[PDB]
Amino acid sequence: DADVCGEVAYIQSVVSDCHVPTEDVKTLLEIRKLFLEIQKLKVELQ
Amino acid sequence: ADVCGEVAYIQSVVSDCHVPTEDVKTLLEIRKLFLEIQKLKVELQGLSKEFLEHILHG
Amino acid sequence: ADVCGEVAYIQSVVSDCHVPTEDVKTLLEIRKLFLEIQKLKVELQG
Amino acid sequence: VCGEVAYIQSVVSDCHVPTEDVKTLLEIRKLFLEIQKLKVELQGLSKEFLEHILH
Amino acid sequence: DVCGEVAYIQSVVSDCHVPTEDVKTLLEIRKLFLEIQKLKVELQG
Amino acid sequence: DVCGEVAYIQSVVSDCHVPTEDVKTLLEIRKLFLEIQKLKVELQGLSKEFLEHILHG
Amino acid sequence: ADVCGEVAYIQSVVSDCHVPTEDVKTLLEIRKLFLEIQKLKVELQGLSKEFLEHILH
Fold first, then answer.
1. Which residue range forms the structural domain that includes residue F53?
2. d(CA C10, CA F4)
């Protein structure tokens, strides 16, 4: 309820403050996650 | 009763936010991506330390 | 009998919601995302 | 590989339901079950937190 | 290594005489079905 | 080095002379096949464990 | 906040490579798919060995 709407409202405030389009934020975070996942996989394999 | 009741409950919560559904999805996806990056960094330091401890005391 | 019966069962349940299938999928995706965020916060701060 | 694909094709064709509907319906069922698993894991993490406090 | 792996998968897929997008869709349906079974067993246990 | 990693992947993909979207699709099919095998193995293990837990417990 | 800082950090690294963002994403996806196939093969041999050990002991 207020836990869900308050959480969404908080994320919206933070994203708006960056002045970066939301689709760019998502793409850039996806690239960082992919890079870290590749590092973790290499470590696990060795 | 359980599946349809669950969907009806989520719909009530989402409608009360007065935020477009695709925005709610995008914002939660961004928060999840950020937290997953933090967890991956913790797991990487933890694997490196665990491997070193196994070497030093094994 | 196993696969077709499973599909037929899910179809009956979804139809009984009286909500378009793509809305059911979207709403369940939002609930899953919210719960996954809570779990990640607990794992990181504990 | 080819035998596996041919088998899945036979089963899906026998349902007389469009392939994209089969995929969507199975995805909805999986999402519902994953929400239940997440709720169980969250009560489990809360219990683990309480046990750390008590002992 | 990488190119040899890709060339091998291409040979196997071509031998099925099934469009690549259908192979992907059918394997996705099989995986979804098995994942549902695994989730049901984990939830009761 | 992030840029070095990207440049390395680009060199390997270019050398295959296969469109990037085909490389991605073919690797996705191979991954899906192996994941199905792993799920079948896990399900036989869980099924056996369930039966045993019921019979003796 | 911390995400504004994280976003600019990733942008700084990606811009330095002078490769379009969608290419960076695609190339990293291909590398991840390749490594995931290798990990799945290792997990499958481990599950097979674990099954044999349960039989022997």
1. 1-57
2. 48
Asked if E touches B (at least 3 Cβ pairs < 8 angstroms), the answer reads no
Chain F partners of G27 at a C-beta cutoff of 8 Å?
A: 6, 9-10, 13, 20
Q: Which residue in the set C25, C28, C38 is minimally distant from D42, CB to CB?
A: C38
Overall domain count for chain E? 1
CB distance A40 to G35 below 8 Å:
no
| CATH at residue C6 | 1.20.5.3730
CA atoms within 13 A on the CB side of A45: 15
Q: Residue C21: exposed, middle, or buried by beta-carbon count in 10 A (0-12, 13-18, 19+)? A: middle
Method of determination used here: X-ray
The resolution in angstroms reads 2.2
Task: Please name the residues in contact with C42: beta carbons below 8 A apart, sequence gap of 6 or more.
Answer: D42, D45, D46, D49
| DSSP three-state, residue C45 | coil
Residue G57: its H or E element: none
CA distance F56 to chain G (A): 18
